[PDB]
CSV table of C-alpha atoms and ligand atoms in Angstrom, one decimal:
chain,number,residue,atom,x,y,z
A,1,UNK,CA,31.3,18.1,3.6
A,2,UNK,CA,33.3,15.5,1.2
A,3,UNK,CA,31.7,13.8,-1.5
A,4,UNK,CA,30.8,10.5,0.3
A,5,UNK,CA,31.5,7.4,-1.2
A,6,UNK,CA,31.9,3.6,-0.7
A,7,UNK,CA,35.2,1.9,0.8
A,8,UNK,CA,34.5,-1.6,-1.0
A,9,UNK,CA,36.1,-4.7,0.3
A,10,UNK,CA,39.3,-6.7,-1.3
A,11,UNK,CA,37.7,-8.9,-4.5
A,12,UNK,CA,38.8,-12.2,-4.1
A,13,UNK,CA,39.6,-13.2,-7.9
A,14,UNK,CA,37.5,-16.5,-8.8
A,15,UNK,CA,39.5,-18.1,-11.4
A,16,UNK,CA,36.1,-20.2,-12.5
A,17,UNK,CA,35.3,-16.4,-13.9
A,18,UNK,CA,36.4,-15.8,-17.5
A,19,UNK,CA,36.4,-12.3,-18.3
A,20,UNK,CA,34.6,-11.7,-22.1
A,21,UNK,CA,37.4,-9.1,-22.8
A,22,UNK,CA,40.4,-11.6,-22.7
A,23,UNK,CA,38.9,-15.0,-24.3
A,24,UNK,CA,39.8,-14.5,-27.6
A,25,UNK,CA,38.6,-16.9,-30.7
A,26,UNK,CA,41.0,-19.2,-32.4
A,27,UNK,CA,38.8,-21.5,-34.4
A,28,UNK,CA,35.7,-23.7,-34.1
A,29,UNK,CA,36.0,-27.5,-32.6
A,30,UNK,CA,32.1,-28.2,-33.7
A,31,UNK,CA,28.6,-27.8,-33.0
A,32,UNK,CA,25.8,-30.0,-31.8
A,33,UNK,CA,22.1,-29.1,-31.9
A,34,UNK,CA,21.5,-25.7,-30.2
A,35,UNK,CA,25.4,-25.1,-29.1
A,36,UNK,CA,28.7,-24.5,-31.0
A,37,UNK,CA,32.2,-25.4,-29.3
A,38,UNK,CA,35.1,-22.8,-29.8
A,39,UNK,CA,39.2,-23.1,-29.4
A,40,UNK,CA,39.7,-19.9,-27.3
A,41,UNK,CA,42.9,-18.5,-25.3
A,42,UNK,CA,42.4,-16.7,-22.4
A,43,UNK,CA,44.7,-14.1,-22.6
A,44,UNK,CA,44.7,-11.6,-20.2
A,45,UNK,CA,48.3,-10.8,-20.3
A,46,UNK,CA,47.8,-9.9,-24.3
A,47,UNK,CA,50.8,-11.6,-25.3
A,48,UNK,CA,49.6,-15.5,-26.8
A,49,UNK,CA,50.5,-16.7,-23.9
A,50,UNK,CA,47.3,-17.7,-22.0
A,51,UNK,CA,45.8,-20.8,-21.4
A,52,UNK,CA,44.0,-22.9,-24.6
A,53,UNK,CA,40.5,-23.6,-23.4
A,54,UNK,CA,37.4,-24.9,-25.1
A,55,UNK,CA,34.4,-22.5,-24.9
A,56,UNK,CA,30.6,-23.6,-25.5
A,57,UNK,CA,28.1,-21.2,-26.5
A,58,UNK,CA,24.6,-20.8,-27.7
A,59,UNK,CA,24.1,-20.5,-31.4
A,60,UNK,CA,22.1,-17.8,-32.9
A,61,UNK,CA,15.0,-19.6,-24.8
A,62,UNK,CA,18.1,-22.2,-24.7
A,63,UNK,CA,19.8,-20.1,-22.2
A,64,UNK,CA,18.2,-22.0,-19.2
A,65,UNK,CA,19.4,-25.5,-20.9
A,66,UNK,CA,23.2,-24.3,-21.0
A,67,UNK,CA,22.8,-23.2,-17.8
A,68,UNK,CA,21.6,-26.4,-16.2
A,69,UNK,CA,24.2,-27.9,-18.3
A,70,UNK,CA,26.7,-25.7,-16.8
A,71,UNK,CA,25.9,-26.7,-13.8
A,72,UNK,CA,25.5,-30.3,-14.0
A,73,UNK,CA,29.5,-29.9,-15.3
A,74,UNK,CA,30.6,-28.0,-12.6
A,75,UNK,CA,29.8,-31.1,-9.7
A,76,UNK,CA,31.1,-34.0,-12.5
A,77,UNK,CA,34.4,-35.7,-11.3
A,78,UNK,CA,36.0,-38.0,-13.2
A,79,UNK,CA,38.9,-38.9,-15.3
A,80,UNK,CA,36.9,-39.7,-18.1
A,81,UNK,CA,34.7,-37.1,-18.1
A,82,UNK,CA,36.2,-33.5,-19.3
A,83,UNK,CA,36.7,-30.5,-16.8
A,84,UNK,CA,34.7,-28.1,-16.6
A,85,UNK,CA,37.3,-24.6,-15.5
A,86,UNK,CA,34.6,-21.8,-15.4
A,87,UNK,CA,32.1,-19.6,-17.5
A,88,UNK,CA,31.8,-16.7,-18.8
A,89,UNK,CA,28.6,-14.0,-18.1
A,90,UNK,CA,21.3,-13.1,-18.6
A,91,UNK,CA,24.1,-14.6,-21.4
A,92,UNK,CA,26.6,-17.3,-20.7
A,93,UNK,CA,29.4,-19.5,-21.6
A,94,UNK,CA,31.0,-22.8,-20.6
A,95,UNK,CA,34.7,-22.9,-20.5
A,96,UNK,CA,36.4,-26.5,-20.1
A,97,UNK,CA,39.4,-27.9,-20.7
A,98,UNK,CA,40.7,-28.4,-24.3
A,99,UNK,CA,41.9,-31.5,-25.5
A,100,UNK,CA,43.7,-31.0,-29.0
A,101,UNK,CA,43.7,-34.4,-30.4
A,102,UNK,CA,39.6,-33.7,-30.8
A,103,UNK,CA,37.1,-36.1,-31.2
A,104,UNK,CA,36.9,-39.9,-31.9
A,105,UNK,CA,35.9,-38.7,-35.1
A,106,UNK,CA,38.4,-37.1,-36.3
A,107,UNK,CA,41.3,-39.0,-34.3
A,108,UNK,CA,40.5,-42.7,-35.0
A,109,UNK,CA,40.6,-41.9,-39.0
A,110,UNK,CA,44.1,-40.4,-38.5
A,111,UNK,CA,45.4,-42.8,-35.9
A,112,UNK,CA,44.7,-46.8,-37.0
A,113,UNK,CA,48.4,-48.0,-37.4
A,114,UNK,CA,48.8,-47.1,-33.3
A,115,UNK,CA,45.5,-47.9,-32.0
A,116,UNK,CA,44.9,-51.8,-32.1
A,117,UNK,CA,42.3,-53.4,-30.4
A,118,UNK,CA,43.8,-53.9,-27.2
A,119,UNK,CA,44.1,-50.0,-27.3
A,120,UNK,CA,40.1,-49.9,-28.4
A,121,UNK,CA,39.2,-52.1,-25.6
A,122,UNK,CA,41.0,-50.1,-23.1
A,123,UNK,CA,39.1,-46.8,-24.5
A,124,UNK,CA,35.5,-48.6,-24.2
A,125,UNK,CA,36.4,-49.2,-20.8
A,126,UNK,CA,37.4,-45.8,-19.7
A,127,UNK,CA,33.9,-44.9,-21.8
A,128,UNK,CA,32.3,-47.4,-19.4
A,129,UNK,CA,33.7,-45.9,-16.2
A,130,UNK,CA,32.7,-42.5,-17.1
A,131,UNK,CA,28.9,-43.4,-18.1
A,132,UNK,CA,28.8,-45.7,-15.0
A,133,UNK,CA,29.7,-42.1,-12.9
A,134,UNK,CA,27.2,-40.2,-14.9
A,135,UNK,CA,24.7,-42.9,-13.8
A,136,UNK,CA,25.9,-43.1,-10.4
A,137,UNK,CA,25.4,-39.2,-10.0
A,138,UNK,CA,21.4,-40.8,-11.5
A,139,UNK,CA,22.0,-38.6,-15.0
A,140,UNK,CA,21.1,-40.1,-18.6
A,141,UNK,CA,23.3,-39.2,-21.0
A,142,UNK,CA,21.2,-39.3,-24.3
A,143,UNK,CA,23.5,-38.3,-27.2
A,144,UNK,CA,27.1,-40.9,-26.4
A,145,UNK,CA,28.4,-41.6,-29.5
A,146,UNK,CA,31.9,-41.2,-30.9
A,147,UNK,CA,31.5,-37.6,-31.9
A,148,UNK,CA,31.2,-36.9,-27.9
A,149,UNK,CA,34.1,-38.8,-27.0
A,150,UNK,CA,36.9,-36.5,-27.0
A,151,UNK,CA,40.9,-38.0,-26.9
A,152,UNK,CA,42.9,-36.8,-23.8
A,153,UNK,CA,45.9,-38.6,-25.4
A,154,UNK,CA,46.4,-42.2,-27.2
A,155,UNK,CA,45.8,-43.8,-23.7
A,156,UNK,CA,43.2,-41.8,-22.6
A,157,UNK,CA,39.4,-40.7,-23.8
A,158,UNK,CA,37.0,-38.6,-22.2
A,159,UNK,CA,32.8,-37.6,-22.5
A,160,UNK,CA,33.0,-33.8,-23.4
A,161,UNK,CA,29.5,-32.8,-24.2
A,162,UNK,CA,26.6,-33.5,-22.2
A,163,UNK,CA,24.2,-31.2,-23.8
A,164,UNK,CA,21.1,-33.4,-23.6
A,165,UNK,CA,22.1,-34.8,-20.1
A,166,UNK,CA,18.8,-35.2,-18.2
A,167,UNK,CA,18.4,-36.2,-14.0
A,168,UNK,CA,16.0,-39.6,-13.2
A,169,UNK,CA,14.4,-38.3,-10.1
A,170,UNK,CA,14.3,-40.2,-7.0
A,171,UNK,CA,12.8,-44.2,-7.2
A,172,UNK,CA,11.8,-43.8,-11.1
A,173,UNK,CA,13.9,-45.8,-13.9
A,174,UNK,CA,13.2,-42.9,-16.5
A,175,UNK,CA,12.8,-39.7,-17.9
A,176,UNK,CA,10.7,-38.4,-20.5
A,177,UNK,CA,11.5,-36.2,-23.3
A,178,UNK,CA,9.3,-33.8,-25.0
A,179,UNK,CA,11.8,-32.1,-27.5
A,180,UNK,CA,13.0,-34.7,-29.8
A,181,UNK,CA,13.1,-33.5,-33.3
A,182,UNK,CA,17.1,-33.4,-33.5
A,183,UNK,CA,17.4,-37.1,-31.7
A,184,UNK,CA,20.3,-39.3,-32.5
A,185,UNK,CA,17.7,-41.8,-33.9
A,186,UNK,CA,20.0,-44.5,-35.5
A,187,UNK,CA,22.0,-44.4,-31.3
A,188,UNK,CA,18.7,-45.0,-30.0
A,189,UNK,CA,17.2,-47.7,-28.4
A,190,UNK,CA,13.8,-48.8,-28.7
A,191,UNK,CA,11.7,-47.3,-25.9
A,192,UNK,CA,13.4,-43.7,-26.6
A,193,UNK,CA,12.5,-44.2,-30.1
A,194,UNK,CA,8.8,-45.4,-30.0
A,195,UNK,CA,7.8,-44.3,-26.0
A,196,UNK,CA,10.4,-41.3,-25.8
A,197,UNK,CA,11.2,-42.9,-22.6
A,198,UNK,CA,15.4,-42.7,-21.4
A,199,UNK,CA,16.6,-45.3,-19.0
A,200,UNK,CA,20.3,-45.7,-18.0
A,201,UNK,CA,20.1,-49.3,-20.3
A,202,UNK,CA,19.3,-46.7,-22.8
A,203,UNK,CA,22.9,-45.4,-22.4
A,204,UNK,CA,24.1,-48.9,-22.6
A,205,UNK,CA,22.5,-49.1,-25.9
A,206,UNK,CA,23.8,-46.0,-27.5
A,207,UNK,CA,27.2,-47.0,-26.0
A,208,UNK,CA,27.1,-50.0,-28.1
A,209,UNK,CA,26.6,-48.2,-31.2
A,210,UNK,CA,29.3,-46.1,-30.1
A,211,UNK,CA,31.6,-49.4,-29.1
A,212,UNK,CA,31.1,-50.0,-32.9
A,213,UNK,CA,32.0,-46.5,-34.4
A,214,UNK,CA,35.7,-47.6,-32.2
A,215,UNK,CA,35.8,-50.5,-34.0
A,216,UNK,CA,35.1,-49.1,-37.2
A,217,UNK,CA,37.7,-46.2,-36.4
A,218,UNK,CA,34.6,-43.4,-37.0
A,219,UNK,CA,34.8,-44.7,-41.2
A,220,UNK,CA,31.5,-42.6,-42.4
A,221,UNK,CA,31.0,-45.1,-45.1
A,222,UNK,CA,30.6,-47.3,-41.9
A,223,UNK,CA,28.7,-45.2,-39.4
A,224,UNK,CA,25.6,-46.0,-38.0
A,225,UNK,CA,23.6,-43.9,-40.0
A,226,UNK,CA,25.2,-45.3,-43.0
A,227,UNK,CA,24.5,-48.7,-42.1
A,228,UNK,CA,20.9,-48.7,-40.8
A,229,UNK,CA,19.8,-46.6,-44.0
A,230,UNK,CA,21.2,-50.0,-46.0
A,231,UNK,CA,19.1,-52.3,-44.4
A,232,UNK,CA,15.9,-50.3,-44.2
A,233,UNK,CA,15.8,-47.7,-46.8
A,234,UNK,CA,17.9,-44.5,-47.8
A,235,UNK,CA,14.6,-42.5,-49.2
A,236,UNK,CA,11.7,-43.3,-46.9
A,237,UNK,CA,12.0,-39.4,-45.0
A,238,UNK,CA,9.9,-39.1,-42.4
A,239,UNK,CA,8.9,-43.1,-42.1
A,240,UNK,CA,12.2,-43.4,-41.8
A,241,UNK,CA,11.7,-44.2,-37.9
A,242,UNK,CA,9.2,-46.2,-38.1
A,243,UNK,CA,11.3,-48.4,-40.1
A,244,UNK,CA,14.3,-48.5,-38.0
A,245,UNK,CA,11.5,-49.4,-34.9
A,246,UNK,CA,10.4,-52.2,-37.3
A,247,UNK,CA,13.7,-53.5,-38.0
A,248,UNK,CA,15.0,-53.6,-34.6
A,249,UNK,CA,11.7,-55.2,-33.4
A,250,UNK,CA,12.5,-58.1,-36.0
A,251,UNK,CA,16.1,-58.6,-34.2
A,252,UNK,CA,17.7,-57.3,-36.5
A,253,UNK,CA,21.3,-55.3,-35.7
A,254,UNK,CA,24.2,-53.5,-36.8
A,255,UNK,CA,26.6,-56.0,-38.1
A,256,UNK,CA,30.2,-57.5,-36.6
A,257,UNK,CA,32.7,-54.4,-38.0
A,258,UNK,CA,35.7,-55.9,-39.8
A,259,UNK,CA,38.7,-57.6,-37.9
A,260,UNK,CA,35.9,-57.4,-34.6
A,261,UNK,CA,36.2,-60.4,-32.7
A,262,UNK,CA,33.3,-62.5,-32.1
A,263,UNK,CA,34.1,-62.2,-28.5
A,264,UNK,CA,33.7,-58.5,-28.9
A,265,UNK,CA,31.1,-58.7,-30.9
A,266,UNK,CA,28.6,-60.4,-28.1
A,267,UNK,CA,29.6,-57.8,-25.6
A,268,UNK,CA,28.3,-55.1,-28.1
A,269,UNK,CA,25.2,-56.9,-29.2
A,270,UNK,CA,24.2,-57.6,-25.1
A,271,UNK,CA,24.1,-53.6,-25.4
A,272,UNK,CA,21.0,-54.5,-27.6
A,273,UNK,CA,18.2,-56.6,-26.4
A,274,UNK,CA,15.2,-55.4,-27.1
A,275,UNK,CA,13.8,-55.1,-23.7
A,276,UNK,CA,15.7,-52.7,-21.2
A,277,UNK,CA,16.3,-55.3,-18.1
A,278,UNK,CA,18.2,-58.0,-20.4
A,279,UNK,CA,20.6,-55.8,-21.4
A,280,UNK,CA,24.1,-55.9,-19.9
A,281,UNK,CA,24.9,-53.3,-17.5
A,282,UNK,CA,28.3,-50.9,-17.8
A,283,UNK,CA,29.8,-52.9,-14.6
A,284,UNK,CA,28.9,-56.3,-16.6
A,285,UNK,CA,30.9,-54.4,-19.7
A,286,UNK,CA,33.5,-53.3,-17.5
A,287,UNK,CA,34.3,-57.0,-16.7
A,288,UNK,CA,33.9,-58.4,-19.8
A,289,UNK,CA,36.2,-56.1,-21.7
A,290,UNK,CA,39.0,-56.5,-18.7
A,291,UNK,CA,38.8,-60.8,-19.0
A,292,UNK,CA,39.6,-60.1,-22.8
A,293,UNK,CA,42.3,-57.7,-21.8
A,294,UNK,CA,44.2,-60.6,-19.6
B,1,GYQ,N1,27.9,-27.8,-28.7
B,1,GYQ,C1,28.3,-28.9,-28.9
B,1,GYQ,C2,28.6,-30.3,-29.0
B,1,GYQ,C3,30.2,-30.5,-29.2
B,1,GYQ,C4,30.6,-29.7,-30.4
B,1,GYQ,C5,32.1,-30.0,-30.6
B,1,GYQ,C6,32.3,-31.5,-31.0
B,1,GYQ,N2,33.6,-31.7,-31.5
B,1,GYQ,C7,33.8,-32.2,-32.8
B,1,GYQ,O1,32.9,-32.5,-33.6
B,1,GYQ,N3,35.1,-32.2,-33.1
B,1,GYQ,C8,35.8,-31.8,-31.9
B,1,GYQ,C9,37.1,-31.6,-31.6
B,1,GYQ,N4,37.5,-31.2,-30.5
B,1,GYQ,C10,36.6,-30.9,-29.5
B,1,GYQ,N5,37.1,-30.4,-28.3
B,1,GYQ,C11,36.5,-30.1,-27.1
B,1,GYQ,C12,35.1,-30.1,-26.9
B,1,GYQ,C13,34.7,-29.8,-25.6
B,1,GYQ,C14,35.6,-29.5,-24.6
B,1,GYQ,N6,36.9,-29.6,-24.8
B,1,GYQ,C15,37.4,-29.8,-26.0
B,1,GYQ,O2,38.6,-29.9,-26.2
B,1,GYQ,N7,35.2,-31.0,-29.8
B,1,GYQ,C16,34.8,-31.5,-30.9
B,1,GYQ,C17,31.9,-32.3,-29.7
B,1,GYQ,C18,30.4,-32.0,-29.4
């Protein structure tokens, strides 16, 4: 008889799926390490109407890591962490929210006649609250630093990249890396640097060194990098982190930024003991930064 032929179901429209055809490229927000963010619309009317979204992709084997970055996204919940809206499809890409005030970087440059120090504390806090989440959920982090921190508005910041977020299983402290030849060395604490070891006082380390890029307003002339190569060397290559190990085993430490309140300054530098158990804890932070809010 007839030509027989298959009477499919209604397709429920999932609107966490981004079809390739209508996300259309406006310009790039950055890249870090094996990724590159995008400003896209999603436009499937055609007319420029269409939602603004971010959209991170691979660069031209790291499939699998996007993916398990996808989906560590997809379950985060928090007002200081960015949304995660869908993906787009063996290829993929993340879509989240876009924030157009950008990064730390590029805000705090722009923006130091509104943003006093009340206004900095009140961001380290919200930074706080989101790593505290992320370690909660038993994730490590292990790239925070101002370029990650993305501005939601002049009252708000949020984490937007988590491309080297890692789980701690079940009853163990750590997690080991094995690829670790793009690390953030100068964020770094100690036992990532030497044992390649990341603990959640890890995070509270590189926060620290972020807390200082705030209070510094993200001045290059000032960043981290800028400031360690000073004290231990600017042409020592690839000795360089055996340097920066030596320095910090001596005590040594990023200095008080300018106009940083001593006050402020001992909350940072409890980010940096030596030893992961003495230093302070996001909670502990947390605390501190809302007595000098009062
Ligand atoms: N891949 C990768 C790492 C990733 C690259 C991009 C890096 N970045 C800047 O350097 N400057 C930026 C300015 N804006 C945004 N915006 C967003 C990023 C993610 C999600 N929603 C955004 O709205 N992002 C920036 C942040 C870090």
């Amino acid at each position: 008889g007839d030509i027989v032929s298959e009477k499919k179901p209604a397709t429920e429209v999932d609107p966490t799926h981004f079809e390739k055809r209508f996300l259309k490229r406006i310009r790039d927000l950055g890249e870090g390490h094996f990724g590159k963010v995008e400003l896209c619309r999603y436009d499937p009317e055609g007319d420029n109407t269409g939602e603004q979204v971010a959209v991170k992709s691979l660069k031209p084997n790291h499939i699998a890591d996007l993916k398990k970055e996808i989906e560590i996204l997809r379950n985060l919940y928090h007002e200081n962490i960015v949304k995660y809206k869908g993906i787009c499809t063996n290829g993929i890409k993340l879509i989240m929210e876009f924030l157009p005030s950008g990064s730390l970087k590029e805000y705090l440059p722009k923006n130091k006649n509104k943003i006093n120090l009340k206004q900095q504390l009140k961001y380290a806090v919200q930074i706080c609250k989101g790593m505290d989440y992320l370690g909660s959920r038993q994730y490590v982090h292990r790239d925070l630093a101002a370029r990650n921190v993305l501005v939601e508005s002049e009252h708000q910041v949020k984490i937007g990249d988590f491309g080297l977020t890692k789980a701690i299983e079940t009853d163990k402290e750590y997690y080991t890396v094995k690829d670790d030849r793009d690390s953030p060395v100068f964020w770094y604490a100690p036992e990532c640097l030497m044992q390649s070891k990341f603990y959640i006082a890890s995070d509270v380390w590189s926060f620290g060194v972020t807390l200082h890029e705030l209070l510094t307003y993200c001045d290059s002339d000032s960043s981290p990098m800028a400031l360690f190569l000073k004290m231990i060397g600017p042409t020592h290559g690839q000795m360089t982190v055996t340097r920066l190990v030596n320095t910090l085993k001596e005590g040594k430490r990023l200095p008080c930024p300018p106009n940083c309140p001593d006050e402020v300054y001992q909350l940072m530098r409890k980010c940096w003991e030596f030893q992961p158990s003495n230093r302070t804890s996001f909670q502990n932070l947390i605390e501190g930064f809302e007595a000098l809010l009062k």
